[PDB]
């Protein structure tokens, strides 16, 4: 009958949804996931109205609608943000025991992302500040490891140094930023490395503050 037919269609839709949810979270592409969810929604809408009036069809349709709504949270979660420590915080607060390697879209979808929107958003913003600080550090590392002194011939006598203004300005900006990094609640992570780079910046600052004056005096007395 019509009830048997709508039950069969419901079973087919459930099988499709389960097959889609078997994809691990690592390999779930948010754009393709959204396109597939839209295709499934269009397939659901293709059913006749008599089959649409059934309660189970309404429940599955609203579940897919909620999945489409939380697709934005899925996009925000699947990035360079969570890493593994933010995932650990999410597991701790949500009291769920998953496996990172075995993580799949089904496990996350079972937990109500819409209900836990505030928790997810807080974790995402914490991760936002965290890659901000981490990329700022990495920028410091790459600008200081690849930085070279501007050596110049001096009357075929030796090789002196220029670029004092640019180098000193860079040192001052970096030391100011590192000192200000002690603020913000995100500072509690990677503190020791920040202090080590602060010590490095102070050392280079003092060394080259002495160096510029030594160079000036030596040039003057050599003349």
């Amino acid at each position: 009958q019509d009830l048997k037919g709508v039950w069969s269609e419901l079973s087919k839709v459930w099988e499709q949804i389960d097959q889609m949810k078997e994809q691990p979270w690592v390999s779930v592409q948010p754009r393709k996931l959204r396109q597939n969810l839209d295709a499934l929604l269009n397939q659901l809408k293709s059913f006749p109205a008599r089959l649409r009036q059934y309660a189970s069809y309404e429940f599955v349709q609203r579940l897919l609608k909620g999945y489409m709504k939380i697709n934005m949270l899925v996009i925000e979660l699947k990035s360079e943000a969570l890493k593994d420590r933010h995932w650990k915080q999410l597991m701790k607060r949500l009291h769920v025991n998953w496996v990172v390697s075995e993580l799949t879209l089904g496990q996350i979808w079972d937990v109500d992302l819409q209900k836990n929107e505030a928790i997810v958003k807080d974790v995402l913003l914490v991760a936002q500040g965290e890659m901000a600080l981490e990329e700022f550090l990495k920028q410091i590392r790459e600008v200081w490891n690849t930085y070279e002194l501007d050596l110049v011939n001096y009357q075929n006598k030796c090789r002196l140094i220029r670029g004092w203004d640019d180098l000193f300005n860079k040192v001052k900006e970096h030391i100011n930023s590192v000192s200000a990094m002690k603020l913000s609640p995100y500072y509690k992570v990677f503190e020791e490395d920040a202090l080590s780079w602060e010590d490095k910046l102070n050392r280079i600052m003092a060394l080259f503050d002495v160096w510029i004056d030594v160079q000036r005096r030596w040039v003057y007395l050599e003349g």
Binding site: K121, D122, L125, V126, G129, A180, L183, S184, P185
Partner: protein, 751 residues
Amino acid sequence: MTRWVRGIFEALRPLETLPVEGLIRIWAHEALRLFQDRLVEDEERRWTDENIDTVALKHFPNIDREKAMSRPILYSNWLSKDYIPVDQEELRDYVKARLKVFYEEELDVPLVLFNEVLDHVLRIDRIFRQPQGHLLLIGVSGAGKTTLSRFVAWMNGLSVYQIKVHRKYTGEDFDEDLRTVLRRSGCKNEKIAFIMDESNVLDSGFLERMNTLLANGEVPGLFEGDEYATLMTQCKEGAQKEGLMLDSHEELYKWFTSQVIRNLHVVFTMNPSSEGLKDRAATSPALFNRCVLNWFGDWSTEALYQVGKEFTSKMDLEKPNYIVPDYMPVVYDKLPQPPSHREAIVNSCVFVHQTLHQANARLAKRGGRTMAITPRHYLDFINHYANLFHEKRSELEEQQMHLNVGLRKIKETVDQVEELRRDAKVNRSTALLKSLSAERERWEKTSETFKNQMSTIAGDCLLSAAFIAYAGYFDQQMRQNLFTTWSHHLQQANIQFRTDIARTEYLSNADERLRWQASSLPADDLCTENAIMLKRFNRYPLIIDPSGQATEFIMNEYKDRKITRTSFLDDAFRKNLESALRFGNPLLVQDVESYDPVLNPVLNREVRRTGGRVLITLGDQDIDLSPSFVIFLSTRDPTVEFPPDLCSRVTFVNFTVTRSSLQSQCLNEVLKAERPDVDEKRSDLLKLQGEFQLRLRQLEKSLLQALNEVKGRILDDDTIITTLENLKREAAEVTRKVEETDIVMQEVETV
């Protein structure tokens, strides 16, 4: 004219069937958006409005001018599509829904959607929904420029990016910010609605780069060296994303430039200033060539009235016994007739704002110094009104509950003494009953007085809040004149309030005044009012004083909270402010004339509340804002001028002496030093506004504490009646003061 034709063509492209009336409607709408939009004052707007219709009817006879030119002309594509004109109310409903959603995502602070905002949203949306649609907004601070720009940008998917300006903001920092915004807009194909205030525009070095970006669509010289190499490297990937494989560097740069024009709208928010606007024209013509400009200044009376109604919804303001007065003092022409109590209160608030505009204009005519008045002042006033009403009603309700508990305890004690009598002592018991009964009727009279106070509380709180938020820069005579004007206006509206309200005592207590006097603060009426303002404020107070007494006063007041002193000239200022955010200690600021724009996030109270955290965006760094943080701005030169931006973010506290402050001080000194009895009676009258009642309440609390221990031991001589007759004599004293208040007031006036 060319923009006119292009706009009509755009509005005509999706349509296929359109009557002549619809074409005239589109023509009139485009004319109003091109010619009426840039107008400054009201008369020019009315002139343009009437002449558009006149030209339309003269050049097009035999058309129905109603449909052809209806008064609420308005076009949008949000409802349905194809830029079809929409009715005002349906658009208002749509914007309310989108504004609730926006509330859910960002900027939870309420916004009120009146007609002016409803028009500006569509104007900004029309300008954004256009390639290279740079926009200039000219309006008084707090009229809703940045807020509407951000709202429309969010609704259109545009991501708002605004730079953070501060002192010693070298051109290199602005270059880096421009590089970041250009890279985000073009390379990553993410639309950006770039917003700037006038704080970061005052420097003329940045205006050249902004002019070049506005005109050419890309600024040469911003990208060079290895930076240009990284730009090209990411531009190649961006071209890969769009499927536009190109390899030549100049063609890739051209594609990046085109992406920048298509996906970068720059919004310049500026305060109205004719000389400054002319200077900006002199230094950058494109701000009036490439940038279409939109003017909205002070809120109209309708806007103020609607904001007042919306922000006074939690407040009770409902008097079933509110008798309507004939010949109401009306400032809102659409005020319901007869008005309810809440309508009358909001009308009075709008009158307060408009009479402060009138007073400021009159003082400017006199030749004195004026401070710009902004709708932020109205919002601060209404917030003070709500807070004061809630606080005062809470105090009155708790006092009524305390009195009811006392009355129930007294009834229980009377019944207990009656039971004891059921068992020289009997005469003592009878005297005890007589005294208890008499004090009971006295507390019933106290209940009646409480009911009267609850009657007058709305007007008292309104006048007090208007004094706190609005006044503060004017001298004592102008403050008193404003207060008398407000009081007369309320008396014309039958809004019940005390005829002899005392501002200092309705807004403070004895202990607070004694604490103030313990620190360096002279016992002056101006000084007490200034201390009141320094106590109750929402925006951070800006203190002006030639003597520096206020600085020492607030140093001594906040010494226990390790308050720190720091000037704007000192380079450590920023660092000190950092500490003020981390720890929470108050931080006094001097030398406000050389203002540091980095304070703008602090003064604007731009708090991001997320995940059990409160953050402040100090420049480019987010900092945990301590709950007990407060900042005081101070100066020493009375003859100083402030930008309207700063003037609208702080509450002014003027300590300067004038011909009316010194007059009052000398008159008070003479009264105290030559007629000590008259000064004593004046203090008696001035402290009668609660302080004696407060002492009575405290002693009654002590009496209840003593009486709670009532079993045998309270009858050491069957008469603990000494405490209650003490209460009776202080009560009789204050009562006699109350009946003979007019004679004492008249005598003090004569002396």
